[PDB]
Amino acid sequence: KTGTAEVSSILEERILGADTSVDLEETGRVLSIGDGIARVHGLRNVQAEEMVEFSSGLKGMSLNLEPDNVGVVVFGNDKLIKEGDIVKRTGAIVDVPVGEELLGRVVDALGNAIDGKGPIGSKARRRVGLKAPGIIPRISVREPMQTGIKAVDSLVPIGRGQRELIIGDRQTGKTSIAIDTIINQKRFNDGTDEKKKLYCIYVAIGQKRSTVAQLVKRLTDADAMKYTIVVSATASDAAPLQYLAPYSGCSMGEYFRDNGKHALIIYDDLSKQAVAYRQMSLLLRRPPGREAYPGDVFYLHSRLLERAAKMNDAFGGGSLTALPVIETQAGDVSAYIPTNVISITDGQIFLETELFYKGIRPAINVGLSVSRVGSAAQTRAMKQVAGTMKLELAQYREVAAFAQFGSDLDAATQQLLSRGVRLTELLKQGQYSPMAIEEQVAVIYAGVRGYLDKLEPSKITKFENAFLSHVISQHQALLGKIRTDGKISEESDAKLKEIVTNFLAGFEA
Amino acid sequence: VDLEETGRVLSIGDGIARVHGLRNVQAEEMVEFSSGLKGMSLNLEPDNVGVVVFGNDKLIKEGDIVKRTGAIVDVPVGEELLGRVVDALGNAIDGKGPIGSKARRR
Amino acid sequence: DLEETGRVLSIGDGIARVHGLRNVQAEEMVEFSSGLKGMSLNLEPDNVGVVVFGNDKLIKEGDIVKRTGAIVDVPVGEELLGRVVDALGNAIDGKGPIGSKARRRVGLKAPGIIPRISVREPMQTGIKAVDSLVPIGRGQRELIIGDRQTGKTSIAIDTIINQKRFNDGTDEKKKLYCIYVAIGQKRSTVAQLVKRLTDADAMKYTIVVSATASDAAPLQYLAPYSGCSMGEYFRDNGKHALIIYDDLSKQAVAYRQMSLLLRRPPGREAYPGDVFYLHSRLLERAAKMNDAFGGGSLTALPVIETQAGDVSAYIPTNVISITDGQIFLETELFYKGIRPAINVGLSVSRVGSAAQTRAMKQVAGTMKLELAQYREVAAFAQFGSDLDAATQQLLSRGVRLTELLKQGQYSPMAIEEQVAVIYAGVRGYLDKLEPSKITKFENAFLSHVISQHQALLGKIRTDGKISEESDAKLKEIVTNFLAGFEA
Amino acid sequence: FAKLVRPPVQIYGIEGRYATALYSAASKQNKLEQVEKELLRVGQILKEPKMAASLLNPYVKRSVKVKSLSDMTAKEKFSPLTSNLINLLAENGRLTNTPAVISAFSTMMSVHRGEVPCTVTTASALDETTLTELKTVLKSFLSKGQVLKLEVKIDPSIMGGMIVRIG
Amino acid sequence: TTGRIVAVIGAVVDVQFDEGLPPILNALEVQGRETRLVLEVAQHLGESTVRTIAMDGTEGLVRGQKVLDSGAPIRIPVGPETLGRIMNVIGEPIDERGPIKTKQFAAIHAEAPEFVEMSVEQEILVTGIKVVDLLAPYAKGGKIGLFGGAGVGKTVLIMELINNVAKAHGGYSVFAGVGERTREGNDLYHEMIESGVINLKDATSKVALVYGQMNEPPGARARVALTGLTVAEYFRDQEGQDVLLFIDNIFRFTQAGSEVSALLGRIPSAVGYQPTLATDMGTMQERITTTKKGSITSVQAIYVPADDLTDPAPATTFAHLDATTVLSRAIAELGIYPAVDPLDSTSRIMDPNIVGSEHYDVARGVQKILQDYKSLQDIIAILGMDELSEEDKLTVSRARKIQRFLSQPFQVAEVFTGHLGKLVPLKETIKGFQQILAGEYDHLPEQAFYMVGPIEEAVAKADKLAE
Amino acid sequence: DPAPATTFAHLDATTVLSRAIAELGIYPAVDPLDSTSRIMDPNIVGSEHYDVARGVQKILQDYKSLQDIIAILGMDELSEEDKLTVSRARKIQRFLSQPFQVAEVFTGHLGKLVPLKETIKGFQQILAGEYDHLPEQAFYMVGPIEEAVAKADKLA
Predict the structure, then answer these.
(1) How far apart are CA A479 and CA A503, in angstroms?
(2) CA angle B82, B87, B89 (to 5 degrees)
């Protein structure tokens, strides 16, 4: 032979007559194993990218059909493995169990709902390899989507079917951002429409069991988990597993989507995947590339992420909303994959630490945060207050040009800063947050109509608590109406206002 | 085969014909492919000739007989290129047909 | 003779793919027909990747590589004292041979903690600046970091020069075997250097391991390790040896290059990271031994050269994490004048006080601090923007004291002198003097006390730890003398 | 994968890897001798057009190459079943490469109980015994010849440099 | 079975086992290696030839040389006879006091425990160091990484902690010395005896020392960490113990991984990395947890390589952390000891929810204050003041006071400091800042806060600094 | 970056934007940094066309120099001759803005058209800046400068 297998177990029989052959088509003997890279001798005939099963009880994927061997990624351990091992085709590529009993569950991506409670079998299975939808299959997201995070819902008001990058460095409640959204979805999950009931998929890619344990715990505390899959390939979880976790997740969210249901997948995070995958590549001596990453991680992702979409009616109208996540390192988005992602997502969500230390939780660079989309997924409620507000913040910032030394180019403008700041008070959302629209707009309304600037920024927050709960208490009539309209109704503006003013008066004094 | 003044396209779909033979090729030699085309046996490897395809291709294929032209490339040179647009081989592209460059010179 | 010859399977680039030699020892230094050495570092099943030691073009395929059958040791002994050797421990001096026909393995290791005993030692370099702010013990790893004649070397010489006196003393404990490992140090430089030592003839207790600029990369590579063995000898013979590695910057370069040439790759700064292992392993053997070894030491004064002053530099960062403080020499001060030129601020011996000498300590306690305060006012003050009288003194004083840590080239001090000249200032007696007059004072003051108050000085050394008596004696001596120095 | 024996030679010159196929294969069943000798036939049976550019020539097309061994080695009963590696190596292009295997092998049952001078004096007498350099020095001390230049003649060489080497 | 050295390519000894092929990890014994020579199987390279790593003294070796597979990994003593003891990787007294006999032996590989067995929750644990708790409030049984460069009083600081804590702390502690300076261990050692926490009147000291000094083969250095872990796993699970796991320095473990990677025929990843970094990490850090048996509260020295954290290794690390102590070269450079990069000496477990808001808020006010202050710096740097408002000045100053207040002397390293250092019980801290913030300090000399712990003392110190 | 670097070689007209300009909210978000067509030149285009453009490009550059001080500093540090340039530049900016009907959902402003003669003319006036009876950012997102003139007034 040549390079590969001049093994004189191999050579040694070829002599005789090329005799000695397991199957080599659907079985192979592990030619070598080291590095969890099983060159498995034989299997030769095999499909491309068939998931195989190893005589280690592991699964593998015969990823690379090499003309001599099959580069098989090991889905697990490998002290366990030794050579000559039979790796048998399963005849089959990945499908993963799919189902709905993953809602309420923390899983390993194999679809074994491990958590150290072990699994509950999602009886259905589905190819993970399933592709992204077409145009006819798709439809527009006019539908909004929420987080119950004012800022988000307002200023980057969402929709469902997405591909929006969530971006920032760790535990700013980095995760909190996701959580508060999740908590928020509870009401929606109690919410009658089954796009309000939004199946949460948290793909935890490379996210340590402990972090997760906390996280899940957080979720537990929130028991939002009930409508939630947590597809979990933790930090320990083997690289292909982690790698797989999104794709698996991906098939599964599309499932709901195509079953009309609206699922939301949070890929947290492809950052870890890429590494893994690349690595995976590399161990196969298949490339690194830009940023050490081989470039079809884009193909990977590009294909992966299109699978979140907003579907027409043919798909039950459903959606798989992808809010992909990359947690940056120093906002390093120059970072290849981020560059890619920048070209992929229909906006991206910036966090500013700066603000965070400043206490601004959320700390977001809204200014940078974008839904390229924006208006198409909106609500008029929000639209009525937020447009101007965006603008006003534009001004705050703009006037942050000179909000420096000095901050009065006049009182008005000084005022604009005051206002901006007032509005700012609203944009911080403590840990755990899960608003409704009416509440948000209500609170916004006051400020955006400038009633808070008399009021001082600290007391806005205080107010905000009081006010909201106050109006919530009384004017469920009105609120009910606004909520109902999904949009701010003028009558209510005045009634609200009046409440507000007065209430405001009660809060302030 | 004649792997002396001819070679067989060892591999192609590189636009570089790794060509076995042509062995009595000079260094830097203009060669000619079987696909019409010129190439230059730029690279003398013991074993093959990295032959730059002097143009472009999709015509070429393995084993194609690459014949030495046995000449190091020259281009027409002259004095009659005045008012003339040529391709890099020093032959027209003007569409005014040929130049007056009698001579060629390496 | 079968496999006590091997044929150079193929050769180029000092990587001798070696046929035969499989029966080889691992880490065998082997022998070439060219008489050149190599080490069969990598025993591949096919050949022996032999890092060929030396520089060549002097070989060809099939050349016989004969086993030498030996793992590297380097000639060792005290007979390298009074010797300048090349890395192999062979002459370049050409003074005939060494006496170090004992050899001792470069492959020898760092003590167990039980074999080691922490430093509490003194050891002074005679350098006021040093001994004051980084007073030295023994066994210690301390980075000398400083650059291309900042008199970078000059300082080391003075240190060594200071040790002369102990080596002229009978106090071994204050004696030091000085090992100057020269990496990359051009021959001229070396020529001078050696010459200087000769003149100082401190050479007698001194090895100069010299791998100059031209030298083959492995040689230079090996050289530290060579050095690494040699001082340990002294150390097990209770002796306190000093190795100066100047410098591993070159080694790393060589090594990487070597690695790269081995196709063995790298990372950071193009260096492979076990350049750390290299140094670590190199450096761990620096120790102050337990008692079992005669309590010896091999005190390591490694030297590192800052390219562009940079230290954040992986290799510098590394070395710092190993070293037990670093002595920053800061050249600007040199342009600025200042001999020596130091970032004192960076100059730290974390060990510091563990490495002390009580005589000095009496003034030094105060001094480190007063300079600390001075520095504190380097920092607080000493811009174009900061004063009050309090600080004005510290500054004045400080500036004065600066002169005392100022220090000419080719010239260290005896400690008592150091304490002395310092003393005046500590109790503030020469703030009266401008900074400019301090040195003059110092010079004068010193020859005066040497002349008369050797009584006192001798004594201050004797009690090794000042006393009010000395103080008082000093005090008049100085004040009055000071009065005499001036008027 | 196959628990086997790869006895002296070994060494894995790739063609040592090849040798090792038969260093377990020929070796087992001890069609060692059959083959050991087979090779001997083959080498020079080969190397002419039934090797050369009427074979090795890639421009023969590989299948056809089989079918000119399997018409060349099932052309010869000198590989009544060790042909197959031929017909494999054939494919695997190791045809010019066979000497090294052959050697290695042949050597791997000869250099599989021999010895050779390697010595700082003349020989290339060689030997086929493991114990040696005792016996041979009685064949050395016996016959006088070789290139003399052949092995060390510890004269021009060592010795020859030596005064020079002092100076 | 038996293997032959086929290649020693570095300390990667490729051993060809012919008819043996014991699973990966199996400790193989080189026959004739007196240097108790475990080769750890890494790969079945094929040919029943394995990539192994030699983990002991190697030289002399000839190709072919005989290895007898121990057929399983290393067994090393695990359990209590290690306290006191300084053990090496292979579990062997490098305390050198006769053998170590903890009768439970181990393969030093273990898994990530369950999520349910994982910390799903933890608690702020006071340290009593202002800055430390405040910004990085610490969770029992978690992994805390201390990023910090080279000899930065890094050691001093840890020591100081150790001093405060490991002393205080009744449980066992494990020290796993990865690439630790022989010397540093020496001092520590001598101290340890001295401290009498190690006293050998108790091989059930509160501390097991595992030292794996940098002189060691990298592979060895790499594995010593696991060793310490395995023991500590002994202690957590078996001894139910609140373990303190002092790790100095996790960087070197990793460093060893990456370092080897090339040679393994693996690619030395970005920056040269181990691509197996993650998994290494995953397995390592995930092996650590709070089980409900014990807790392994993990103090991990993390060298910031070449001061790059962006550097993949540190970059990775964060995930596995729960609290990061990033020490600031600048703060350090200001001589401030605490030398912190407080703006990344953190704990996720900072939150009013957890730590009470007062702490939290105050901290946030501070975090902010610094932050704002931070902002200015770039201007001021060349451009001084007065192009800034004096409230900005106030914050600046306050931030500065605070700065100094984080400077809190070191009791341990009077050798370095001369100072006696402080422990600040939390209130003096919370209050402390609330006061400065309150402007209650904002007319004092800033050096008052400099090298103080409790704020009162800062006042006391103020008074005298005010002459 | 090689890809665009090369791309440029094949161009014949280019629209070189400025995300900063985009960021300044402006739609169009352009930036002649090489928003050119080599067929730009006073013969080819109107010479006036050409000329107007150069004057404009110029002013903007100078204005551009001062511009970060403003980025981190309001409507303030100036000498007025220079304010003239600021304002005009600001106007130029503004007149270049064109609303977007095709994006009416996003903009809340309906797209417009200004064929060339008006455009050049438009700017010739702006250069002549008469719109001093008028303010400036009331000159955003129109077609005709005229509508901008109108649009300012009603605000007043």
Answers:
(1) 15
(2) 100
10 Å CB burial of residue D48 (0-12, 13-18, 19+) is: exposed
How far from chain centre, in Å, is Cα F99?
13
Residues of C numbered 263-292 whose beta carbons fall under 8 angstroms of chain E's beta carbons: which are they? 264-269, 272-274, 276-277, 280-281, 283-285, 287
Taking the domain A93-378, which CATH number applies? 3.40.50.300
In sequence order, the 6+-apart residues with CB closer than 8 A to the CB of E170 are E206, E242
Q: Same domain for E278 and E176?
A: yes
Confirm whether residue C54 is marked as ligand binding: no
CATH 3.30.450.40 for domain B2-71, yes or no, is no
CATH 1.20.1250.20: does it fit domain A379-509?
A: no
Q: Is C151 annotated as a binding residue?
A: yes
Indicate the DSSP class of residue E421: P
Domain segments of chain A as ranges: 23-92, 93-378, 379-509
**In the CATH hierarchy, which fold is given to the domain comprising C71-356?**
Rossmann fold (3.40.50)
Name the pairing type of β-strands C240-246 and C177-183: parallel
Please indicate whether residue C350 is annotated as part of the active site: yes
Q: Do D12 and C46 touch (CB under 8 A)?
A: yes
Question: Residue A268, annotated ligand binder?
Answer: yes
Locate A479 and state its tokens: 């609120």
- C-alpha span between A235 and A217 (Å, rounded): 17
Distance CA E179, CA A134 (A): 56
Could you tell me which chain F residue has the CA closest to the CA of A400?
A: F72
For the record, the structure tokens of E30 come out as: 């080189």
* Contact of A244 with A127, CB cutoff 8 Å: no
Residue E153 assigned as binding residue: yes
d(CA A475, CA A489): 13
Could you count the other beta carbons within 10 Å of the beta carbon of residue A406?
13
Q: Helix, strand or coil for residue E187?
A: helix
Method used to obtain the model: cryo-EM
Among the partner-chain residues D11, D115, D119, the one whose CB lies closest to the CB of C1 is D119
Residue in the block written with tokens 């250097």? C193
* CA distance linking residue B70 with residue B66, whole number of Å: 11
Q: Count of CB atoms within 10 A of residue E446's CB?
A: 19
Q: Residue E28: which CATH number?
A: 2.40.10.170
E130 and E188 part of one domain: yes
The encoded tokens of residue C418 equal 């150091």
Physical contact, B and D (3 or more Cβ pairs within 8 A)? yes
Same domain, E204 and E86: yes
Provide the Cα torsion C287, C288, C289, C295; round to 10°.
150
Strand segments, DSSP code E, in B28-64 are: 29-33, 38-44, 49-53
Resolution (A): 7.4
Rounded distance between C-alpha atoms, residue C110 and residue A148, angstroms: 62
Full residue range of the structural domain in which residue E462 is found: 350-467
Nearest to C21 by CA among E30, E63, D115, D127: E63
Closest Cβ–Cβ partner in A2, A83, A84 for D92: A2
| Residues of chain D neighbouring C20 (CB-CB closer than 8 A) | 118
Chains in contact with E, counting 3 or more C-beta pairs less than 8 Å apart as contact? A, C
Integer-rounded Cα radius of gyration of chain C: 25
Q: Which phi and psi angles does C3 have, rounded to 5°?
A: -100, 15
Residue F56 maps to which CATH number? 1.10.1140.10
Residues of B in contact with D59 (CB under 8 A): 1, 8, 20, 63
In order of A456, E147, E179, E309, the CA distances from E317 in angstroms are: 42, 10, 18, 9
- Cα(C69)–Cα(C4) distance, integer angstroms: 8
Q: Do the beta carbons of residue C193 and residue C208 sit within 8 Å?
A: yes
Of E121, E279, E370, the CB nearest to A217: E121
- How many residues does this entry show for chain A? 509
Q: What is the chain A residue with the closest CA to E309?
A: A329
